[PDB]
Structure formats: C-alpha cells, structure tokens
Amino acid sequence: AMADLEQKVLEMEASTYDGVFIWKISDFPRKRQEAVAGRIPAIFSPAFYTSRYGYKMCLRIYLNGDGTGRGTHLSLFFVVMKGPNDALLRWPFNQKVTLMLLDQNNREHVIDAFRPDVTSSSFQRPVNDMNIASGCPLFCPVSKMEAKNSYVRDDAIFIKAIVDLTGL
Amino acid sequence: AMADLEQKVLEMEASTYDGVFIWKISDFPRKRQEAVAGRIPAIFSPAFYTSRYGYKMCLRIYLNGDGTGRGTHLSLFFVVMKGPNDALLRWPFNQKVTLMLLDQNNREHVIDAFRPDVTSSSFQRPVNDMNIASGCPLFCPVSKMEAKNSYVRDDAIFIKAIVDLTGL
Amino acid sequence: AMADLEQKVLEMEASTYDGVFIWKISDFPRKRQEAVAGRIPAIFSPAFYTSRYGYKMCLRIYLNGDGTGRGTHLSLFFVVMKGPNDALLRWPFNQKVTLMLLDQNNREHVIDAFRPDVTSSSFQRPVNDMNIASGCPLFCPVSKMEAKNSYVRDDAIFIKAIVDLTGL
C-alpha cells in the first residue's frame, strides 16, 4: 500500500483532463534494448482524460514493434480504459485521435491519426480495466527516429496524443 | 500518519477548481441502509473550489433524509468551508448553487437550485472548518430515485453541483 | 522516504499550470524574525508552470532583504527551474513577469514587473535544478508592509506572480 499510494501519486501527477497528453520516455536506449531483446516488448503510459469527468485513456508503445511492425517500426497504440464516470458517457467512444512522435528540433514530427470504428470492441464501454488497444502498428520506421535524428535527445523521446473533443 | 497523507491524496484527487463537481457514491445500497438504520445519517463529499484560489466547498447528503425530509426524501446540502485563501475573497459567499441527482438514462435529472441569503450564518466567512450547511431537505422523494428508476445503476448514484461564477 | 512522498504531494498540491501563482506565507512574524536574525534569510516557494507542459518556475523571497535591499526592503525574486519538458520549449525564457504583495484590504497592492533579459544567464535553458534568480531587490519597504498596514493579516501575507503568456 506504499507502492500503491506511490503509484497513485505518480498517476495523479501525470493525468491531464483536456484530451492532450505528452508522454516523456526516459532511459530510452535501455528500454529500446529491452524491447529488441524481447524482455519488455511494450510499455503503458499513465492515464489521461477528455474532460474532468470524461473518458479514461492511456497509450501503449512497442519500441521494437508489434504485429506488422514487429522489428521494423515503432508501434504506438491508443487504449480506452474503464473510467470512474463511464456510466455518464456516450458509447461507443468515437473521438478522432491523433498520435505524434515529437521532433526535438521541432521541424518534422511523426504524425498519424485515426477515426475509431463504432463496430470495434476497442471502443465499447469497458468491462475490464482496459479494452483491446488499437492504433498504429507501423507508426514510425525504427530507422527514422531511434537510429539518431532529432527524435531522440539526451536519451529521451516525447510522445504526444491529442483527442478531438468535438461533440463533448 | 499514513492515514493523514492517504487522506490528502484522496482529497486532491477529487478536487476541482471551476465550480463544477460530480460526486459518485458507490456501495449505495449499503450506505442507504446505514442511513435508514440511523447508524450513519449523513455523508460529506470531498472538497471542490470556485477557482484555483477560490471558495472551498463540499456537499452533505442524507440518504434517508434530514429534518422536514427525514424518512421521506433524500436531503442534499451545500457547505461553505474555511478555505486557505478566504482572506482574499468577498464575504458573504453569495453565488447561486445548483444541485443535481443525475439520471443515468440521461433523460430526467433531479434538479434544484438556491440563492444564498446574505443574512444567513451559512455564508459568512468561516471561523470553524465548516459553516452550517444549507440546501434542500426535500431534494428527492425516496420513492423516485433509490427505489429503482434510472438514478441508481450498478449500485451507484451521481450527485452534481454547479456553482454559478457570475462576478468572480 | 515518507518525507520524500509527502514532499511530492505538497508540491503537486501547490502547482498551477496557467502562469498565475498565489503564495500564502503563514507564521509571518516568526519567519520575519528568522530573517532579521540572519538564521533563514530566504525562502523558496513551491513550483508552478506556464502551461500543462510549460516552463517550471518558483519564487524566492527575503523577508529582511537581499543585496541593495538587505535590511531595508522585502526582496522578491523569480526563478526559472529545470522543467521536465525543457527540451520542447523555446530558450531563453523571455516572458514578462509581474510580482505582487497583496493588500488584504484590497485597495493598494505592491506591484512590480520586469522583462527578462535575453542575455542573462538567469533565463537560459537550465543545466542545474535552478538558474540564478532575478527580480526585485527593492520590492517593498519593510516599513510599508510588515510594520502593520493591510498586507499582513492574521500573521500571513500573500505573494502573487503572473507570467504573461504572450507567444506561448
């Protein structure tokens, strides 16, 4: 209950309530290796929300890829989580989501966006803590970022997510 | 102790600073019974604020009623609390307050509102931790909500408070 | 230890993310003496930010003065701190800053403002936890506030900082 409180505090510290989230991933080189090695393929980010009492969401990343991108790309996914106020929200979750890998030279960010499918189980009201993730298996070529460039800086990268709030 | 810190974290986690607060009350059936039994007549909600450094407030609810509503209605009250920045605020507190019991079918919420009386002890600058509560003794007939309907769902209800910020 | 987590909780509780910060200093008389006595000349305030992922900053105050104000005035300084997202921000920090000592009678606040100098090391990207502070050595005559008046009330004063967000 100390790592539980510690974890809670850590979660609160990272939460945002306007649909915009910036996830700094430090110790990049080590985590990158742990992915390549197959020890820790993926990492979950802290949770964030669409509004003070809105949808609860988090991100999941595979530094060395997943599925169609396994070993060739950085795969990034969006996750709808069971939120405390789900009973008050509209389902399925259907807000457009934009995912980005920030260029720390601020000249060319890697960006992609997707429209949730109303028929996918990924966006129905959560029964478990997290619904099945969905996103970009081929988000970024390992060569592009990682292998230097301006995405990795001082052994860290920044992932940014923007959830369109239209209709909320 | 660890109970002190843990309590602070919970408070911080529930705080809002824009005059809007949604209070989710879980274990509704049990709490409802504890009120009917007379063991725990009322419950206080976590605190929320009108602005980052605004008035501090909380709600107090009697699942089996208080005063004129005892045994017949759900009584809901508003409470002005001693805030850390009270010295910088205007007194008496005189913002219009709207109290709601949310319909989880989102079609017919129970709603009431009141205008604080500048002559009431309930709204003067707090001397004690909490001023005398003020609100709605006959907020909602026990029959309406509670006894099924669409207010209680999966053993929980949602109370919402909106403090008008005109002039702040 | 616990003091580590307790400290983090304290910092989170005080943080703001819109460039506006109000610092309540309690036990004023005692702290004032500790300054006059030379035991504790300065005090740092909790940190606050320009935006959710913006610059990290704090204030430093000398209740009995510093440098040109030592012994005659209250000296107040602004501090740019190493922030978690500095890599994504523009450097040097060059936002106009307004510092205030609030009149609790709300009629005459002590106010001053300054323009960061793009050539000062105080505003370059932080290498250490905190850059050199800069601000107002002659912010307020010890006679004005402190010595009574309406700045000190119930043994407390309020310092307010407003960071102009133009261009951010």
From Swiss-Prot, chains A, B, C:
Transmembrane regions: none
Localization (cell): Cytoplasm
Residue ranges annotated for the MATH domain, each copy included: 18-163
Post-translational modification: Phosphorylated at several serine residues within the first 128 amino acid residues. Undergoes both 'Lys-48'-linked and 'Lys-63'-linked polyubiquitination. Can be polyubiquitinated at several Lys residues via 'Lys-48'-linked ubiquitin chains in response to TNF signaling, leading to proteasomal degradation. Autoubiquitinated, leading to its subsequent proteasomal degradation. Polyubiquitinated by BIRC2 and SIAH2, leading to its subsequent proteasomal degradation.
Subunit and partners: Homotrimer. Heterotrimer with TRAF1. Heterotrimer with TRAF3 (via TRAF domain). The domain containing the RING-type and the first TRAF-type zinc finger can also form homodimers (in vitro). Interacts with TNFRSF1B/TNFR2. Interacts with TNFRSF5/CD40. Interacts with TNFRSF4, TNFRSF7/CD27, TNFRSF8/CD30, TNFRSF9/CD137, TNFRSF11A/RANK, TNFRSF13B/TACI, TNFRSF14, TNFRSF16/NGFR, TNFRSF17/BCMA, TNFRSF18/AITR, TNFRSF19/TROY, TNFRSF19L/RELT and EDAR. Stimulation of TNF-alpha receptor TNFRSF1A leads to the formation of two distinct signaling complexes.
Domain notes: The coiled coil domain mediates homo- and hetero-oligomerization.
Family: Belongs to the TNF receptor-associated factor family. A subfamily.
Function description: E3 ubiquitin-protein ligase that regulates activation of NF-kappa-B and JNK and plays a central role in the regulation of cell survival and apoptosis. Catalyzes 'Lys-63'-linked ubiquitination of target proteins, such as BIRC3, IKBKE, MLST8, RIPK1 and TICAM1. Is an essential constituent of several E3 ubiquitin-protein ligase complexes, where it promotes the ubiquitination of target proteins by bringing them into contact with other E3 ubiquitin ligases.
Annotated protein name in UniProt: TNF receptor-associated factor 2
Organism of provenance: Homo sapiens
Gene: TRAF2
